[PDB]
Design a protein around this nucleic acid. Structure first.
Ligand SMILES: [Mg+2]
Ligand SMILES: [Mg+2]
Ligand SMILES: [Mg+2]
Ligand SMILES: [Mg+2]
Ligand SMILES: [Mg+2]
Ligand code: NA
Length: 270
RNA sequence: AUAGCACUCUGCAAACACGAAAGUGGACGUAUAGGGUGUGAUGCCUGCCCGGUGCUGGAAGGUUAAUUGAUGGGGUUAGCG
């Protein structure tokens, strides 16, 4: 979906149509307020730069735990969620309860989904990892028992269940890393719906300003008091590239955790 | 400064930043996501060099601190004079 260059701004704009969406107001009981922090903590200092000035957004409560076991539900509609890059689906259970989930690929209104041990192997069903079939592709993987999905939630993300022993299951993450997961944890069958997210193009600075991103200033343009890459009578790049606080930026590993080293089987060749 | 491009780090109690700690932002986000660095629409593209510094992976052949103290010598009483 390219835009005709009627203006210098409209020349390099690419968007996704996805006309199958709801195109309406979201479910009111499942919507709560949400405000912009501006990248500042309770002390008032800027802890994360390049954040501020976006569009007003409400928060849609997505049910990540899916603890309603053995109750079949039907898909009502697919909606647009500004809080994430994926699409959401509205489910209606037998008793009449309404909940929001992460819509897998191809899920449309009228589909039947269950979250239990005896659930069949269909896209959108949540099952423990031991009941999962070997070699399949999963999403919304759970790490701690009972907390809810924490992995493969972005648009188009998916993991593969390589193998499972008696006590653990081996999965390969999207980054290329193989790690161990408890066999009691749960996952969902299929891949996340929104797949054409990376194919979009903003086209102008206005879109980045709409999405709540502030301009980035290179360290070279700053003064010696501001950035280590400061000073010089012209365009100069004096020292090894570092962060504004003195940390190396090229090929320097920053992982320091020692508590969960046993889980990672093979690294992503970092 | 900018949309675009590339490199690199981060598997989530994430990397990173604030504080003396608790705690907070990142994010009520989950690698099509977040941070750092360089270049700057688009067309055609982007040659050689790992000697130096840096980073990454190893051997552990040489040395190496903290920790221990078999000895060796000295001082002073006591035994043989
Ligand atoms: Mg930034
Ligand atoms: Mg940029
Ligand atoms: Mg300085
Ligand atoms: Mg300089
Ligand atoms: Mg150019
Ligand atoms: Na070198």
């Amino acid at each position: 979906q390219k835009c005709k260059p009627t203006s210098p701004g409209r020349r390099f704009v690419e968007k996704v149509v996805h006309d199958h969406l709801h195109k309406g107001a979201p479910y009111a009981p499942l919507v709560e307020a949400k405000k912009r922090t501006g990248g500042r903590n309770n002390n008032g200092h800027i802890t994360t730069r390049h954040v501020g000035g976006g569009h007003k957004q409400h928060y849609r409560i997505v049910d990540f735990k899916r603890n309603k076991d053995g109750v079949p539900a039907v898909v009502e509609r697919i909606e647009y969620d500004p809080n994430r890059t994926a699409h959401i689906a509205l489910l209606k259970y037998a008793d009449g309860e309404r909940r929001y989930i992460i819509a897998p690929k191809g899920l449309r209104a009228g589909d039947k989904v269950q979250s239990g041990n005896d659930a069949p192997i269909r896209p959108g069903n949540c099952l423990p990892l031991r009941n999962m079939p070997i070699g399949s592709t999963l999403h919304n993987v759970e790490l701690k028992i009972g907390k809810g999905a924490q992995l493969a939630r972005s648009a188009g993300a998916s993991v593969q269940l390589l193998g499972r022993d008696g006590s653990y299951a081996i999965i390969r993450l999207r980054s290329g890393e193989m790690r161990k997961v408890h066999v009691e944890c749960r996952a969902v069958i299929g891949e996340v719906s929104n797949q054409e997210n990376n194919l979009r193009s903003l086209g102008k600075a206005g879109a980045a300003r709409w999405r709540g991103v502030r301009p980035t200033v290179r360290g070279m343009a700053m003064n010696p008091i501001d950035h280590p890459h400061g000073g010089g009578e012209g365009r100069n790049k004096g020292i090894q590239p570092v962060s504004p606080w003195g940390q190396k930026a090229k090929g320097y590993k920053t992982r320091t955790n020692k508590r969960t080293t046993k889980m990672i089987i093979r690294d992503r060749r970092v």
